[PDB]
Specification:
It is a single chain. This protein is α/β, with parallel strands linked by helices. It has a single domain, classed as Alpha/Beta hydrolase fold, catalytic domain (Rossmann fold, 3-Layer(aba) Sandwich), CATH 3.40.50. Helices cover 41% and strands 16% of the residues. It is built from eleven helices and eight strands. Strands 1-2-4-3-5-6-7-8 form an eight-stranded mixed sheet, with helices on both faces. A hairpin with a 2-residue loop joins strand 1 and strand 2. Helix 2 packs across helix 3 and helix 5 packs across helix 6. It is globular and about 60 Å long. The two termini are 28 Å apart. It binds magnesium ion. One of its GO terms (molecular function) is aminopeptidase activity. Keywords: Hydrolase. This is Proline iminopeptidase.
Length: 299
């Protein structure tokens, strides 16, 4: 079931998946999508956790994308981590959720960290899935992964970027290969992922503004982003998930494991950025162990 909830003057669309056999003290899980502006669709399958673990799972579309209010006329400086933090708490309040687990994927994990560093009273645990701790590290990682590509594929990327011919078929092929190795290794791209991308391309305000149109580097308003100096303030337990071949390489998420006081990590072999799509059952099994551990602690 689904509805909109108020966030200021806007409407945030939420979806609630209830478990078939609700377990005692299994606290609700709020799933944060990435992009930004990608909508919930690509992380829809994480709702399987409701039946698998006996808890309620909540998805929503962050304001400005998907099924929520579109604001193409907002000034560019409207779109900030603080806005989405405020929205998050507005969703929890309207649904009457006091104590909760958060799982965020890509930008969703960045947003998860922004939520956590602020020490909200209701946060029981956070799962950061496939996320960098700074854009600086994210960019360094892109260069490292390009250095690891076959020489032919790297040459096409380097050569066409240098010339500006970034719609040449060689570049398009080489960029798609990078995507298939490091973003989503399932071919064809899962329809849930395609659906996120389609809605974003139809109305790309949030994604274009915050991430930007550049294939490999963030040139949008997130270009300078970092949460590293606030990570010592996280009081919630944190699980850091990444893929073996993730564009979120180990150096990108190292600050989370180095600076968050209560933290552990899990790296999935044979997966990349969209682990939840590439090995859905394995991904959810690891998440389920973490959620359960902290259900018990909260109780
Ligand atoms: Mg404008």
């Amino acid at each position: 079931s689904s509805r909109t909830v108020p966030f200021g003057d806007h409407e945030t669309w939420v979806q609630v998946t209830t478990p078939e056999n609700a377990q005692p003290h299994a606290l609700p899980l709020i799933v944060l999508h990435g992009g930004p502006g990608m909508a919930h669709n690509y992380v829809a399958n994480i709702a399987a956790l409701a039946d698998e673990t006996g808890r309620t799972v909540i998805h929503y579309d962050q304001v400005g994308c998907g099924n929520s209010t579109h604001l193409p006329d907002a000034p560019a400086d409207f779109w900030t981590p603080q806005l989405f933090v405020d929205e998050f708490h507005a969703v929890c309040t309207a649904l009457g959720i006091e104590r909760y687990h958060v799982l965020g994927q890509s930008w969703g994990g960045m947003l998860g960290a922004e939520i956590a560093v602020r020490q909200p009273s209701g946060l029981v645990s956070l799962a950061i899935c496939n996320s960098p701790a700074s854009m600086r590290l994210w960019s360094e990682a892109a260069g490292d992964l390009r250095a690891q590509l076959p020489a032919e594929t790297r040459a096409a990327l380097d050569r066409h970027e240098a010339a500006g011919t970034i719609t040449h078929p060689d570049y398009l092929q080489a960029a798609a290969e990078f995507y298939r190795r490091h973003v989503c290794r399932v071919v064809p791209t899962p329809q849930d992922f395609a659906d996120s991308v389609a809605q974003m391309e139809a109305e790309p305000t949030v994604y274009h503004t915050m991430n930007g149109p550049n294939e490999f580097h963030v040139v949008g308003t997130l270009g300078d982003w970092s949460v590293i100096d606030r990570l010592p303030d996280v009081t919630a337990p944190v699980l850091v998930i990444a893929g073996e071949h993730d564009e979120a390489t180990p150096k990108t998420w190292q600050p989370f494991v180095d600076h968050i006081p209560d933290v552990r990590s899990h790296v999935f072999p044979g997966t990349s950025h969209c682990t939840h799509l590439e090995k859905p059952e394995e991904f959810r099994a690891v998440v389920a162990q973490f959620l359960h551990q902290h259900d018990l602690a909260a109780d």
